[PDB]
Amino acid sequence: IDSKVSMVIPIGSYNADTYKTTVDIGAAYGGNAPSPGRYYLIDSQGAYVDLGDLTSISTVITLNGDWSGRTVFIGRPYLMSYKFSRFLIKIEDDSGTQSEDTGRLQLRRAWVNYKDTGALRLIVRNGEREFVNTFNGYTLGQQTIGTTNIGDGQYRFAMNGNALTTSLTLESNYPTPVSIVGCGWEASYAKKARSV
């Protein structure tokens, strides 16, 4: 997250009537209101809450429960993006790059290798349609209760359409790390005239 700052909730714990506790985050930022934006509140285990759009006229928030005498973390999220290029038959021998520019090509599938990743999304847009795919850490049967999922593996999905209209994108705005290694694709080819 962005602009991290630690803080310890003071002794004053809520009020008996509604057992809702206040924080007054202004103290953490040197007795000053922070810049406008969206803010999160991650505790010492991993569960996080989503506060509203904080302006410069208020610095008081309310939480659900007792809390009190605990350590928290506050910050803002940012975005990551990456867009692939077109998929073509490329042959290259360190002397030059040759790209085949004849025939028609239809794509079938694709795959991605990852390591130490928490969450990710992939978006495919062919003509006017959007398909969203999501995966999250490990798979069922290897996770452990109590912690966050950060692991390895491989992911395979479906890509259908012509090779001159399709596009692929990656996005992430979660507080987890990301790492990508390689990728590939499969297709079917058809020509009508020999080259050379």
Binding site: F131, A158, N160
Partner: protein
Amino acid sequence: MAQYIPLNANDDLDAINDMLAAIGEPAVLQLDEGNADVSNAQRILHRVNRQVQAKGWNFNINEAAVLTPDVQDNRIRFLPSYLRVMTAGATSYYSNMGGYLYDLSTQSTTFTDPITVELVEMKPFSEMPVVFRDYIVTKASREFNAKFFGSPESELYLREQEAELYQQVMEYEMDTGRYNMMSDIGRD
């Protein structure tokens, strides 16, 4: 379960999971419309079911059915769940024209009294007998493999499986009806 039939099973999800197995990938786990594969598979399954149900078997044909005309303007509607319209033991001229029942012999669309015809209606996939369900699933898997992902070893086995299932379907068909030929004969 491991010993007997699992509790509260969903047939359509199992059929989709079986269809995806031919490609070589694990389950889908929700059957949602967001994924690309599910939408492609469902249409093929529906088309194959509708095509197979239309051949006409011994548990589909309802010989004696009654249709009744409307009151204000004498007509009979043509619902989209009808598959075949014929007469029991004579030539018939029936067709759809403008969403109503047409009679070519008379060249009119004005029925005045209820009539009796022979027709076949559609049923949902989950209420068919088992062998038909297996046959339909194998057939649909064949098109799904052929059109969207060409694998050379998933084929050459589904053909043998399909023939084996077809033979069993035929034997099941021949057992419901006895079909005696020496009947309706008697004399000194």
